[PDB]
Design a protein around this nucleic acid. Structure first.
Lengths: 165, 150, 213
RNA sequence: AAAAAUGUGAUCUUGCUUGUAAAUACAAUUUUGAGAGGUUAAUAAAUUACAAGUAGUGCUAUUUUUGUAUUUAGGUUAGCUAUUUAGCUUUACGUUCCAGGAUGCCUAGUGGCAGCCCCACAAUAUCCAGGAAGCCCUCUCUGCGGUUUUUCAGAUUAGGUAGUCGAAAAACCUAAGAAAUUUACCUGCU
RNA sequence: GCGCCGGCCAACUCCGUGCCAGCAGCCGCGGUAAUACGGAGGGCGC
RNA sequence: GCUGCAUGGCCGU
RNA sequence: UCUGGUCAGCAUGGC
RNA sequence: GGGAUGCGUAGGAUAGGUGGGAGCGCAAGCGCCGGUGAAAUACCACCCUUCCC
């Protein structure tokens, strides 16, 4: 029972692409004093016409979560811009964060996404034992039974703090 | 030239014609009043800082400022040589007065609500008691230029 | 150069010295050598002390700077003694110090005293080449005094030649030659060319004429 | 910095030559837009520090007390024109912007002012002119720049001089086939 | 009946026309108000 | 709506 | 004199 | 080789140097001494610079 219940594992915020803290190391400042940690990431994909053609990229991305830091964040997080907080918005797996997608090559990849819900929010929902699949060892796979359902997912969060819409 | 020399009414305080001329040089936009004031106030400035009577200080200044010789260009067969020549007595005054006011305006010191200190300081600096200041420089420079091309 | 040749030099020199059979006073033997193909400008010049194997015959004037014991020995020897107390006084009065330096060929000083002597004395003594030789406070001076007497200084200066006192009329020709050899040894060591540098060598008594080797 | 004392073997120091070490920065506006390529090819100035040799000078070579301190400073060796003062900018000769560092040199003083701690003025000459930008141009994306082919009758009613490349078209820029086709000053005959 | 009617050269208006069609001995005329082209009415000459 | 080269008038020079 | 400017002030031939 | 020659300052003075040196001389003088100086000088020598033969 309690096992079946859905809770949020790692969320992680993120930022847009391009260089960050261009004038001075900034934009990391936001994400700072927000969420508590300070991630930074880099990128690949050299020739960008209006992007850089830098290889190793300063590119801003970051955040993550845990338990309880993203609760008390993802608190006063959701209840931010959500014209349609949920619906079609997230999908089979449980949760999402998106907006309007573009015709781009997708699907055959690990599936990180451009998608921007908020400063592209990533609530990811998983119930269960699930640490099973992720963890290195006999990985195991999710049952596709005890898997999240969007319906269940658009529950839990909604029951608390904010309407589904 | 421009016209016949018109005689100028002498100064109300000290009935010196030369003074009025100086005042005219200062004035612009026909603000005759401000112009007279600046000169008068300067004279008062000349009195305090310097024991001497202002009228004397001014006249001496003009004397130091008047160029005796100036160079005028002329076209010779080749190139335009700058012929040195004397300067009319009338011409010398206009140059002297004009140069004083210009140099006076030149001074950094912005004293009195107006220009009045710059005039006061300029004149003293001019005197040859103190023969220095921007006004005298121009005067000395012209004379130097002349007789260079004697 | 060779021993036999010098022996002849010495022997001849003694015979030549005359006027009478011999002066009343004992003359001394001088050895003079001229050098060639050496530039005096460089540190080619020689200033050095040589201990002669058989003494000079005069036993060079020597001064001793030091305190009791060392000073006592000096007095017994009959040498001038400069006491520890005097050193500062002498530094102050250049007039006396200059005189003292001119009068004596060598100076021996208690080793501990060396800091003080150069501080005060060094300006006068050093230029001269007069700087004292240190000896332990409780050393036995006699052997040294004998050698320094029985020591002679070879000082070329900028000039090409050298004159040194080798001995006395009293000493044997063999001894004079031995002493000359010690002098020659220094030159041999100084330049790579060695003795080759010696242009000419001569021996002579005080009164007597010089004879070329 | 001043004072006193011990004292390293008294003692004492302005320099010349060789070896090693580090700064002197850089970015930006602007440029044919951007990146990459020799910001080249060249040759690297000079300031301080330690060692040795050497005239120097015997070489490394001390401790205690006192005021913030009572010290020297400041400038000076940028280019250009000029017969002097001066002036201009502020330093350029591969071209653009800028620092003056060595030695030696100058004022320690003169003039105005009631007075000054208040304003003005001197200084030779040799050393390197050094540092960054910057390089005919080339390749790529591919460039408000600018290519590729064709046609050219005829000015409210027509001509005389003529209008940025003579005009126009379509289109090319990884590709250039392909087709239509003006006017301003100014005027007329029976 | 025949030629001519812009000037030389005597005899003029309308319409058609539109650098066309045409005229022309010379100067020239016609590119939309042409006594100059073509017809018509009128006129001059013979 | 065209033609100030078909013009009046008026104006500039 | 400039085929100066204005038919867009008005007037006016022609289109 | 013989005769000349050697000018910072201080030093009675134009100190090229170095070794010997407490004397050389009837004396005068000269030196030591004293002193100045980085160095001391008579007298005996040797080594030099420049000039002459």
């Amino acid at each position: 029972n309690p096992m079946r219940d859905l809770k949020i594992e790692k969320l992680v915020l993120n930022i847009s692409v391009g260089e960050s803290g261009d004038r001075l190391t900034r934009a990391s400042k936001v994400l700072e004093q927000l969420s508590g940690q300070t991630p930074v990431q880099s990128k690949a994909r050299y020739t960008v016409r209006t992007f850089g053609i830098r290889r190793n990229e300063k590119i801003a991305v970051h955040v993550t979560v845990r338990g309880p830091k993203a609760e008390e964040i993802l608190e006063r997080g959701l209840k931010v811009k959500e014209y349609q907080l949920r619906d079609r918005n997230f999908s089979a797996t449980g949760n999402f964060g998106f907006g309007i997608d573009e015709h781009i090559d997708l699907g055959i990849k690990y599936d990180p996404s451009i998608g921007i819900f908020g400063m592209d929010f990533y609530v990811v929902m998983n119930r269960p034992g699930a640490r099973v699949t992720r963890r290195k060892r006999c990985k195991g796979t999710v049952g596709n039974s005890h898997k999240t359902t969007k319906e269940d997912t658009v529950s839990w969060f909604k029951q608390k703090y904010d309407a589904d819409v | 030239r421009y016209a016949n020399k018109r005689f100028r009414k002498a100064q109300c305080p000290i009935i010196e014609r030369l003074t009025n001329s100086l005042m005219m040089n200062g004035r612009n936009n026909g603000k005759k009043l401000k112009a007279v004031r600046i000169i008068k106030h300067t004279l008062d400035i000349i009195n305090v800082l310097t024991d001497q009577n202002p009228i004397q200080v001014v006249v001496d200044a003009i004397t130091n400022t008047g160029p005796r010789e100036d160079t005028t260009r002329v076209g010779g067969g080749g190139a335009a040589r700058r012929q040195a020549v004397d300067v009319s007595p009338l011409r010398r005054v206009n140059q002297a007065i004009a140069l004083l006011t210009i140099g006076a305006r030149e001074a950094a010191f912005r004293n009195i609500k107006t220009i009045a200190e710059t005039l006061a300081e300029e004149l003293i600096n001019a005197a040859k008691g103190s023969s220095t200041s921007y006004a005298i420089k121009k005067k000395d420079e012209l004379e130097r230029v002349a007789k260079s091309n004697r | 150069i060779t021993s036999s040749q010098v022996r002849e030099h010495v022997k001849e020199l003694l015979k030549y010295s005359n006027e009478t059979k011999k002066r009343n006073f004992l003359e001394t033997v001088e050895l003079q050598v001229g050098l060639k193909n050496y530039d005096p400008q460089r540190d080619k010049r020689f200033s050095g002390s040589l201990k002669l194997p058989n003494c000079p015959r005069p036993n060079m004037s020597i001064c001793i700077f030091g305190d009791a014991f060392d000073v006592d020995r000096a007095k017994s020897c009959g040498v001038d003694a400069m006491s520890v107390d005097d050193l500062k006084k002498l530094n102050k009065n250049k007039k006396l110090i200059k005189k003292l330096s001119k009068k004596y060929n060598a100076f021996i000083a208690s080793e501990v005293l060396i800091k003080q002597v150069p501080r005060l004395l060094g300006p006068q003594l050093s230029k001269a080449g007069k700087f004292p030789t240190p000896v332990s406070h409780n050393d036995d001076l006699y052997g040294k005094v004998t050698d320094v007497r029985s020591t002679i200084k070879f000082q070329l200066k900028k000039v090409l030649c050298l004159a040194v006192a080798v001995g006395n009329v009293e000493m044997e020709e063999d001894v004079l030659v031995n002493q000359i050899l010690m002098s020659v040894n220094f030159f041999v060591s100084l330049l790579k060319k060695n003795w080759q540098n010696v242009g000419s060598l001569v021996v002579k008594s005080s009164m007597g004429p010089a004879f070329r080797l």
